[PDB]
Design goal:
The chain is mainly beta and 310 residues long. The protein is 4% helix and 35% strand. Among the domains are: 11-59 and 183-205, ligand-binding face of the semaphorins, domain 2; 62-178, Immunoglobulin-like (Sandwich), CATH 2.60.40.1510. Strands 4-6-14-13-8-11 form a six-stranded mixed beta sheet, with no helix packed on it. A five-stranded antiparallel beta sheet has the order 5-7-12-9-10, with no helix packed on it. Bound molecules: 2-acetamido-2-deoxy-beta-D-glucopyranose (NAG) (2 copies). One 2-acetamido-2-deoxy-beta-D-glucopyranose (NAG) binds at residues 26, 28, 50. The site of one 2-acetamido-2-deoxy-beta-D-glucopyranose has 3 residues, from loops. The PDB classes it as cell adhesion.
Length: 310
């Protein structure tokens, strides 16, 4: 269908994003370089890319009826509203005395809730998707049916509204509940470094901490300073000799005696300088190797500190 995504960092934020979004919850759906939002997509896309329908979260709006008298039915309904997905239910009007005109209406609703009505009236008249239910001349014990469709545009909290026929003292009490949370089978307590707990196959990091395994603690800005894991915009990461950790290069450790890989982009080491008399920079008695330049001790000169002032 259509699932518009990016911002999406939880299964709930995914389901909030739009009715066509679903969420893959198995943790080996993703690799290190992928953003969390790749778990949020239409059902075909995630199926196509190897997520098991067993593992695809997709809560749906639904209606739940309860006969709890004579004229309007039912009198209690409970709707779970996934944002952007209508929940529909039917109300039946029936009178033993003859009815003149049936106006189905609701009381004041918030901005976030919308109600429309189909009216299936007696003797071949149907109205569709109107703001109020409307039928003319209902007869003795002859039912008419209104289909009520309720849509939320965001996650609401528990609340109720009433549907009434004007001039009649029965009501339909509509309890409305959010359908935004995912149902995820999750461990309690490695994988988030004690700085988050797991939810639907991703880490949910404590206040102050970020990263997919909650490995970084937040700084004022950053980790959009990962461009500063590349020496320039079209270079590899940390000169191919380190890894970007929290937007900073952590350089590879080394086998070699006296060698250290260092620098903002791991571009330097302590052994690749000009040699003389067998040792780098002429040995420790003459100079020290720093990122390809020999820093000679006082008394020695030359690019490899060969010349004790010659
Ligand atoms: C991911 O791991 C589960 C076991 O928890 C396994 O059933 C599944 O096949 C794995 N995914 C792939 C793509 O192999
Ligand atoms: C309500 O009744 C109509 C027939 O009058 C039917 O087409 C529709 O599917 C019903 N709605 C529900 C939610 O059962």
């Amino acid at each position: 269908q259509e699932c518009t995504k990016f911002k999406v960092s939880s299964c709930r934020e995914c389901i909030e994003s739009g009715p066509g979004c679903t969420w893959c919850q198995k943790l080996n759906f993703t690799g290190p370089g992928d953003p969390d939002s790749i778990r949020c997509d239409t059902r075909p896309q995630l199926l196509m890319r190897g997520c098991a329908a067993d593992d695809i979260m997709d809560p749906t709006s639904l209606a739940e009826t309860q006969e709890d008298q004579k004229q309007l039915s039912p009198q209690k309904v409970t709707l779970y509203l996934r944002p952007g997905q209508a929940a529909a239910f039917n109300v039946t009007f029936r009178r033993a005395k003859l009815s003149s005109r049936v106006f189905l209406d609701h009381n004041a609703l918030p901005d976030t809730l919308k109600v429309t009505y189909d009216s299936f009236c007696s003797n071949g008249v149907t109205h569709r998707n109107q703001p109020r239910g409307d039928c003319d001349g209902v007869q003795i014990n002859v039912p008419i049916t209104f289909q009520v469709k309720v849509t939320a545009t965001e996650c609401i909290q528990e609340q109720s509204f009433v549907i009434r026929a004007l001039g009649f003292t029965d009501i339909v009490t509509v309890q409305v509940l959010p359908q935004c949370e995912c149902r995820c089978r999750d461990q309690s307590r490695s994988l988030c470094h004690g700085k988050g707990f797991l939810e639907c196959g991703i880490c949910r990091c404590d206040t102050g901490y970020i990263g997919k395994n909650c490995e970084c603690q937040t700084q004022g800005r950053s980790q959009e300073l990962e461009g500063s894991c590349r020496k320039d915009n079209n270079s590899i990461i940390c000169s191919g000799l380190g890894d970007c950790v929290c937007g900073q290069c952590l350089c590879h450790t080394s086998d070699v005696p006296g060698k250290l890989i260092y620098g903002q982009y791991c571009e330097c080491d302590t052994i690749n300088c000009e040699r003389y008399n067998g040792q780098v920079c002429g040995g420790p008695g003459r100079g020290l190797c720093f990122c390809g330049k020999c820093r000679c001790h006082p008394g020695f000169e030359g690019s490899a500190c060969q010349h004790h002032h010659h």
